[PDB]
Design a protein around this nucleic acid. Sequence first.
RNA 1: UGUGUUUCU
RNA 2: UGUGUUUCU
RNA 3: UGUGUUUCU
Lengths: 249, 249, 250, 249, 247, 250
Amino acid sequence: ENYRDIALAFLDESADSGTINAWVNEFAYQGFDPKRIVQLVKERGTAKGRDWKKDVKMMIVLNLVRGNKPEAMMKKMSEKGASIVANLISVYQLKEGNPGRDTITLSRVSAAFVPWTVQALRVLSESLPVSGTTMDAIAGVTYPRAMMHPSFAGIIDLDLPNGAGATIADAHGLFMIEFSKTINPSLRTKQANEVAATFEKPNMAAMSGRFFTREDKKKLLIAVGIIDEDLVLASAVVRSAEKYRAKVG
Amino acid sequence: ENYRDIALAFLDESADSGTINAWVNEFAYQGFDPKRIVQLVKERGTAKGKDWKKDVKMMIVLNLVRGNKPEAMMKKMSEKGASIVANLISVYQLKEGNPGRDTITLSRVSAAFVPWTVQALRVLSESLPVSGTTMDAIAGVTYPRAMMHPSFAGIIDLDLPNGAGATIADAHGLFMIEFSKTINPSLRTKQANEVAATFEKPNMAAMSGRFFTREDKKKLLIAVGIIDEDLVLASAVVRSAEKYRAKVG
Amino acid sequence: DENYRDIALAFLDESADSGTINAWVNEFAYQGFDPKRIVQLVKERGTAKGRDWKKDVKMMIVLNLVRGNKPEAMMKKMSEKGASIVANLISVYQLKEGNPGRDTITLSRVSAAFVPWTVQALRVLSESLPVSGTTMDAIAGVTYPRAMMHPSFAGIIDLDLPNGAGATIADAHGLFMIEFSKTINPSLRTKQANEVAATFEKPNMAAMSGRFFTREDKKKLLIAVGIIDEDLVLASAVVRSAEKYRAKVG
Amino acid sequence: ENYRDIALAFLDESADSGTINAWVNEFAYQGFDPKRIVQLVKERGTAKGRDWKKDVKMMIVLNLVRGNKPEAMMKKMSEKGASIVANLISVYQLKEGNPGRDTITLSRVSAAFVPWTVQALRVLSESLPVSGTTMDAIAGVTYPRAMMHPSFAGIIDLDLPNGAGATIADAHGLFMIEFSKTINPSLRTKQANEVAATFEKPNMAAMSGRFFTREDKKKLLIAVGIIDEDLVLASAVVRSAEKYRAKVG
Amino acid sequence: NYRDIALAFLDESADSGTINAWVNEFAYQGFDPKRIVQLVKERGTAKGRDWKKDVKMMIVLNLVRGNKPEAMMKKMSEKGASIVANLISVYQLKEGNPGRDTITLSRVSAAFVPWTVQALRVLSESLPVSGTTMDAIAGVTYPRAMMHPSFAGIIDLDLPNGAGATIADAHGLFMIEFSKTINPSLRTKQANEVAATFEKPNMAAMSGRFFTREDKKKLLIAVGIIDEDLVLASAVVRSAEKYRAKV
Amino acid sequence: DENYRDIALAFLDESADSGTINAWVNEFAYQGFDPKRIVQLVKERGTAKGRDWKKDVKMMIVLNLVRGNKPEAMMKKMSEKGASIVANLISVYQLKEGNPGRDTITLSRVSAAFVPWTVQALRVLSESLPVSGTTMDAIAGVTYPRAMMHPSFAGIIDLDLPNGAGATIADAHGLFMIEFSKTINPSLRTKQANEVAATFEKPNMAAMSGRFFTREDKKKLLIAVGIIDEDLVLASAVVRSAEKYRAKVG
RNA sequence: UGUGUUUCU
RNA sequence: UGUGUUUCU
RNA sequence: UGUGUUUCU
């Protein structure tokens, strides 16, 4: 009878904006942060006197065609290329996976510098783990090259009008199942929705990231041809999207 | 033919629908008792010489921005914040998921102390998994910040005149479908009505809660702008409600 | 000695005493689940505590129909008013959580032994059951007989009813049993119908072939609850539910 | 080579159907030898100073009412009965299922000593998994109690004049389909012909058994009322037979 | 430098005699029908047996009971078990995991396949997979000669017009059924998954060199798989397309 | 500190010359092994143990031609004499199997690095190969060039020969490669010829695109082994095998 | 949701 | 490719 | 046949 009144008294209990926001800052998620990624890449690069921006491009291209394990890939590479990778590992302190807060990986570089990643994909389509022609056969259309990497999720605005964001996410999901199957063979026998379950949680975290503003994402999506000035989706996107919904439904 | 004739006689023994339904309601599943929650919080808090009212606020904010998994959220948190979460776990014996009624979770604190939860939402709406700006885009209007958590269902009086309670419930459902879609991304490809069915049962239990009286709920709904002293729904609420009904059917 | 054919043949003239044989049968017979023992123990333990034990049976059955078979567990997810009642029921009847022995009482056992009342409560509780009546109504093409919506119904099935009526009733009950088995055991939800059926048909057969109720007892029960009429004609809902079951499992 | 020539010349080597079929019959699968069973029972029984003939009777009755799983049936039995079953397992080395021919099971005892089994059935027909009253309802008449066990097949002479053996076999099948349906409830929803196929093979092997001669079988069938001294079938047998054929096709 | 070293191997000696001696040292050594027949003949004559008759009995034994003689005696009439006991004794039959000098029933059936392939015409209904079962799986009456793994030993994959490939396909139709019956864990698996369990030792059998190509041609004709003009029997080509469709 | 968001967005309008990027792709491209490194390690490890390493190369090649690329496994089915020397070769050359790093020696890589000898050994032991020369003679309409009867032959193919003669030689080699792939991997036997060709397209291309040997080196090799004459004219059997291949594949 | 997984040549 | 796997009655 | 199994909210 008084436990009810205790709870009810919290109506008049102080909800100080300042103290609440300080708690939020203490409790907030701390780990993956594109801000931290670019900061560390820039710092470590300039400390060794590198053209660090050029190193980013090379690290992204390296990531797009070889994956996320630099030490391993050197053992299966020409000496000319391996020597370059050896340096990239040295200055940027590249790890093979299981990243911590201050850890830099090739995936993280591709994700943080996605506005360039999304441009390189237009050129590398046939050298990717899943080729563009393979995706072109899976979709009924020429699949948008910009989407052919997990990092694309970072520029998706889910709140675009008329469910455009959802449709873009669907179309990207079509690539993600194929990508997930190629780098994890144990998923190749699994159903579409089972494969989707393996990526949709970190994928959602990427799409709901706040590194880029909504206007940043809109500009990126337009610049790379997913959507136009009038926010109209390209047909390849909507047709790839319905393929995805059919597979998982 | 003695013990057999006894059991056989139960055919003519009474099965009154009203008497049976009374038992069903007694024996019905109950996730937790809010009354027991505020009791245990106050008891365990004072026993350690803590400003337990302040700890309630912190646990609520922690719940709003990080969810209901205390041990897991510390693995991705600033050292400062994780330190105080560790304390809260210690003194309040915080567990995760859906344990017994004598067990405290962050989710249950926000539900039991909802008259404060509902005020904190007015402050940190942009730090939620689903932001206030997102809800503003989904509804045609500014979505009432107080509704932006499952614990809001606890202050809903379904027996308000003219089905105003059902309207408020629908307006809250507009948020709940979006919230469910991000914390459980597998639901993103499901129809709105299918998503609504995933939280129908616990949401109903919260609205049907008798911890707060109808007058208590009425006062809460007025104090937070859902309804006025004349029991008239805010325009944004009726808007969000009809958006919801059109999504669901 | 070593002519073994003649040894076996001589057992023709060997004594087959009815008295001694029946005594062996009594020693060797199955001993475990016994509705007679259940009702006896419920009645004894109830009157020893001065309870309206018949009313306790109804409450224990309703408790079983809506919450399942684990009383200690369900108290942790129940109002204090209800939990206090359950606490008493556990105390006087010595309710266990499962793995019953010969002298063990469980909620399932109460529902099974006192099935002539269980079968009446189901008419009223249909929407509060783990599998609702409306859910079964959608699975069958018809309004599924509420009386069958519990495993204990198998105890009143007479498999020897003329014209395979008993088999048809068992089929219709099997339609509910797959749904019930899937809800209380999630690991079966991905399995095929006949796989799920394999999980229950052995104890289910033991229930149908039980001898607690006579054939005339079962006939009366089945009529009283609407499965079959005075002329032993099956209700259409039963035969249509039955063919759904045969289709799933075949 | 010359070894190649040797293998090549096997092409010219014969393959007489009669000679080959003789080998098939020799090498054919044999579940157990009844002869070996009565031997081991008498040997192991006398070696422990037991009334082994009496133990045979108990094992048969035990087999008729409890089946073929000695260790399992003791878990649901009176303390008195389980005590003597434990003994029987000890002295006769009882196993379950289908082990080697040098292994005793309760099922094999009832089969080997069928001239007694067939008499016990006349006494305990209401304590069987399928009762005599049940069979009375399935047939239009009183079903011959002697047929109410799979071991009855051991005394069937298939080479009786006018296909009387086949008629007796069909009458026995009327019980066998019901017996199979209760001990293996998964078969309850199967067609009668499908159920009959589940026991066709071992039942045939029992009827084709040559442990007993035709004269031995004839004497057994007469002594138990299946047929008279003039080799005329009992009316209930021909009845049960035509009931069976109509069920099966 | 290193390039010139490699390039100099052009003028390095490739002596025919020494190379062939290395080949002989390095060559596969294990399963060899020559060794099988040699050992069967030697061990048989050392005990004064009609060893050729023993081969037939061992093959028939293999076709209807499988590859585990000690085990099958425990489920056999005393008359038959006594015979098997002798066969085990003189030929030193093992239960599996054969070494170089090991004789198994499978090995007898494989080495003496020109007789094995004749016995199958007679035993079709006593096989683990019956002829009528294979007749229902194929749309036609499946060639009895193919209803055993040992048939692969007489397949000439180099027969003109892909006839050899077609014969191998038709045999593959039986092999999936046979593999499923003796290994229950494969019964839930897809056709190509089951095929993967046998196609490696199966290929070793087809590419064996015990029989010449003309030996195989003669065998395949004698047993009706193909005719004098090397035309395939329709049952073979129809069984083959069933197999290709499954996998 | 700094904007960071702007630094990232800046990369949208950051350069992306196709030629500069493609140069990086070729540097960073996957490389199975370096033939140069292989002959180095063979000579170094061989001399360090006082061995006729040139002779060991020959034995390892012959071993590779008749037994494949799994040294530990092949010893389990080999004469005691042969297995004894294989054990040595594994020891001094540190032989591994499959596709390990570029600093690792395999039998397959020895045959590839020392292909000017491999190509001569094939002329001698063609009937001891997994696919025999007589088999290839039946598949082609003519006597199939023995020098092509191994994947390592691709290492001496000059694709930039005039009149697409390089492509013709590659196709003629492909006639063998489909058959070789079908026997070492019997699962491919039921696949279409074009599907089989796709299984070895990538490593075969890498071998032909190898720059370990110069065009003049390849030309001299191809002439010395009869694929082409001093006037760069294809042998008739090669053009035959090539058109057989194209008709199989499409 | 917490941004992971990085196969084969 | 390396010639294996041998179920249930 | 041996009368078991009792999920998630």
